[PDB]
Amino acid sequence: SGFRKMAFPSGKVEGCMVQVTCGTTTLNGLWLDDVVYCPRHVICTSEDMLNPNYEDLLIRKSNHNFLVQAGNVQLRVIGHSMQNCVLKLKVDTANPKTPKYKFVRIQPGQTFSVLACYNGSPSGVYQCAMRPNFTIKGSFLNGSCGSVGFNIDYDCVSFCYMHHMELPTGVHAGTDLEGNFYGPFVDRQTAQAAGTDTTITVNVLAWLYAAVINGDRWFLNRFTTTLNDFNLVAMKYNYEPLTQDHVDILGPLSAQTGIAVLDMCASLKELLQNGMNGRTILGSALLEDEFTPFDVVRQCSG
Amino acid sequence: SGFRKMAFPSGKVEGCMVQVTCGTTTLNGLWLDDVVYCPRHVICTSEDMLNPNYEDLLIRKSNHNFLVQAGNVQLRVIGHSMQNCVLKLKVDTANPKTPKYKFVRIQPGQTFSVLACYNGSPSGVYQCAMRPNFTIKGSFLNGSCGSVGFNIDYDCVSFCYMHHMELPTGVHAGTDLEGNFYGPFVDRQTAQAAGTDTTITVNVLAWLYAAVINGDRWFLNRFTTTLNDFNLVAMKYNYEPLTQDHVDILGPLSAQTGIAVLDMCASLKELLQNGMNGRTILGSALLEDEFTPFDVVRQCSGVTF
Ligand SMILES: CC(C)(C)c1ccc(N(C(=O)c2ccco2)[C@@H](C(=O)NCCc2cccc(F)c2)c2cccnc2)cc1
Ligand SMILES: CC(C)(C)c1ccc(N(C(=O)c2ccco2)[C@@H](C(=O)NCCc2cccc(F)c2)c2cccnc2)cc1
Ligand SMILES: [Cl-]
Known part of the structure; x- marks a missing residue:
């Protein structure tokens, strides 16, 4: 637990x-x-x-x-x-x-661990996600460039990120290990801005399933929704559109908890409308979006 | 940043x-x-x-x-x-x-990293704090027993925790590396419960200083408070008492940001009595208490190992 x-x-x-x-x-x-x-x-x-x-x-x-x-x-x-x-x-x-390693380019919403380093020496490890706007909300100081993001599913290290720079808003931009930037960023001092960031909807749903697996059901409701009505509401709170791919990916968690994806979407719609009313979900008063469906299954089931 | x-x-x-x-x-x-x-x-x-x-x-x-x-x-x-x-x-x-290693017993409020393991194989690393009720809000499944908590002070690993069991509320109990439990727990299947927990006040203040260092100032105010008046408020909200030792430890962060510890206590008092009013601090709508003053200085200055 x-x-x-x-x-x-x-x-x-x-x-x-x-x-x-x-x-x-x-x-x-x-x-x-x-x-x-x-x-x-x-x-x-x-x-x-x-x-x-x-x-x-x-x-x-x-x-x-x-x-x-x-x-x-x-x-x-x-x-x-x-x-x-x-x-x-x-x-x-x-x-x-x-x-044993591989280079992988990830998509927005994907999570990875970052080993923050200075002068070739590791200082800390943290978890983060590739934001929908292709930035990462890292914790990096001057000289952190070259620090990498990675995943280690099994014994193979999949390197997915190399830190290059910090944008004016304090968020970070980098490349895959083939040197291709994530996002419309360039490695030069020019006016560059992170586009409006949005919430990773599929990850919020995954984390709500994690809460149900850990015994938290207060946010469940007797309602369901169509995928299109969910997206119409989601966009108003700056949530990313939920695709049929995302619905399919949440299938295993849906089958495990007995709550259909669209049933959980209705809980998310209600949470967006009401807030948490003094309550918490998994120790948070905000809807967490940096846990993917794969992360939830790995952490809850092993 | x-x-x-x-x-x-x-x-x-x-x-x-x-x-x-x-x-x-x-x-x-x-x-x-x-x-x-x-x-x-x-x-x-x-x-x-x-x-x-x-x-x-x-x-x-x-x-x-x-x-x-x-x-x-x-x-x-x-x-x-x-x-x-x-x-x-x-x-x-x-x-x-x-x-290079040492075995150290930590006090409530102190943080440490946990290397969660299964079948002798590391699966994940996370940072947590020894709660004032001597439990840890960890993330552990069956077979995680023996997974350890540690800090690194310069070139030396200080092992401070070994996982033993999960309590009925989903929180965790363990020992130092000398086998002494943190908290009033025993290693047997008997009715055991985590006592009522409290918030680690000095750590909340450290995290408020980290927020200021990162450009979050909305919660600052012109006011200050006495240590006794702050502790009277802190006791009302299930916060741990703030000692003069805690004030001294926050000294460097106070000098760096220009916010005296009692000035920051007045921000914390107003947040406890009024809430965040729709706002967040460092991406959180709750007051985070699992960063010590040392963690904040270490992270905001990039200390390596
Ligand atoms: C590509 C250039 C411009 C040469 C670059 C210059 C500096 C760095 N930084 C370094 O610390 C660094 C260490 C060694 C060399 O550089 C900064 C940093 O990014 N600063 C601001 C750049 C900047 C300006 C204007 C629009 C931008 F988008 C970025 C940094 C701070 C915090 C965390 N991470 C990175 C990275 C890149
Ligand atoms: C001391 C005894 C009772 C022999 C013990 C038995 C089992 C374990 N667990 C194990 O997974 C384990 C692996 C190898 C052997 O046991 C559990 C687990 O704790 N279960 C509940 C026991 C229990 C009862 C009654 C009051 C309790 F506090 C605990 C666990 C789950 C999740 C995370 N961490 C630990 C630990 C201790
Ligand atoms: Cl991906």
Whole structure:
């Protein structure tokens, strides 16, 4: 029993974190096999963060311009290439702690653990979700760039995020491990704004199912709704549209608790209309949206 | 920017988790040097659960009755002893991944990271606090016993909790690594209840300072209060008393934000008496109490391990 925001154990990722320095800039790198992945903005000059030409800046660098430190050992850079917004530094030593891994690009609503790092050293682990507006509400300070997001379903680490920057509103933007940004963001100092953020409806429903599994039924009602009437109400509270895919995904939780997805949608509609009236659901006075249907099943059933 | 519930990196602890089996029971063990620590209730059967005599149950066990598995390797148990509610299994191999460590007993209000494990395999990490009623609002399923709570202070892992059981309300009870329970709990199937819980006042103040550091100021006001008047209000709302020690500990955050601790207490008093009025603080409509002043400074300054 109990329901917590739970991150994956970070050990497999901790053994991959290294510090990457290029000139006056220091950030984190991810060392997997003989490659160190890091944000390409590590080569960006202070004099021009507005319109860097990364191809032009990189062609001027030699391998000895990249200082990679793994613990107290300096790794030797023997090659470098750029893939989208990620720099890949070939090193002369394969990481002996490289776990079984894969690179996965995630969709909005998906959750992942973040190992926040500074100077190649892990400082903390937290759980978060890719917002519908493609930002993440992380906790990151200066020098956190290169810190990664990941999932560890079984013994394989699926790396899904690499932190690149903080937007003016305090939210964060990054790329997958192929260097493709999530969202309409670019790695340069230009006016960039996160689009209006919305609530991840399918995740709120998953978390309401988690509450029912943990004995909380106060918010249930004798009503049901059509999917279209639910979405008409949902949009008015800045909730993401609930698709038939989302309804299908909630099927197992619906079958486990005996509450149909549209029956739970009617509870969500009532919660949006009334608020919680001094009550809580799983220790929260807000509707939580950073637990996916998969997270709920994993945490409740094992 | 941003403020999250953040756990310590768990890698140093993951390298210590093992599976301990005694008969039909399987749970987790903590392998440090040549000793595997686990809940002594691993030696209980169904009938034993109601009123177990652990000394009597243990004297009947031989070393080979304990099957310890570290990854895919079986460790050889060469001795066993009981300390309070923890069983210590001497093994023939020192854990080569044993980090620098210490066993510490924490006080209510103090936070720690929990590495939830099943069958000796880490499944998740979360941050929680030792409640004033000595329970933890954890997230644990069957077989999670032996999962541990810890902090990292510089390069040293301080183990402070070992999971033992779940109470009827869904909250959890365990011991320090010396086998002493936190709270008035016993390791047997008997009617046990978590006492009425209270809010960790110093932690709520720390989290209000974290909100100010992150740009949330709506709850600030021009007022201040005395420590005695604040404690009279705090007692009315089931908040723990705020001591002069708590005020001193919040000193650095007070100096950083320009909000004296009693000035922040006046914000907390108004929030208790009036609510949040539709507003949130750091993405929460409740006053969060599972961040200590040290957690706030550590996260708002990026301390690494
Ligand atoms: C791509 C450029 C512009 C060169 C970049 C510059 C700095 C960083 N940050 C760094 O800390 C950093 C460490 C090493 C190098 O940079 C910041 C940071 O993002 N700042 C603000 C950038 C900025 C401006 C204007 C519109 C923007 F969208 C972003 C940061 C703070 C908190 C958490 N995470 C990241 C990242 C990227
Ligand atoms: C001490 C005894 C009674 C032998 C004990 C028995 C079982 C367990 N549990 C186990 O999962 C477990 C794994 C291996 C052996 O047991 C439960 C569990 O606690 N159940 C309820 C027992 C119970 C009764 C009466 C007052 C209680 F406080 C507890 C559990 C579930 C979720 C999370 N954590 C723990 C722990 C302790
Ligand atoms: Cl996805």
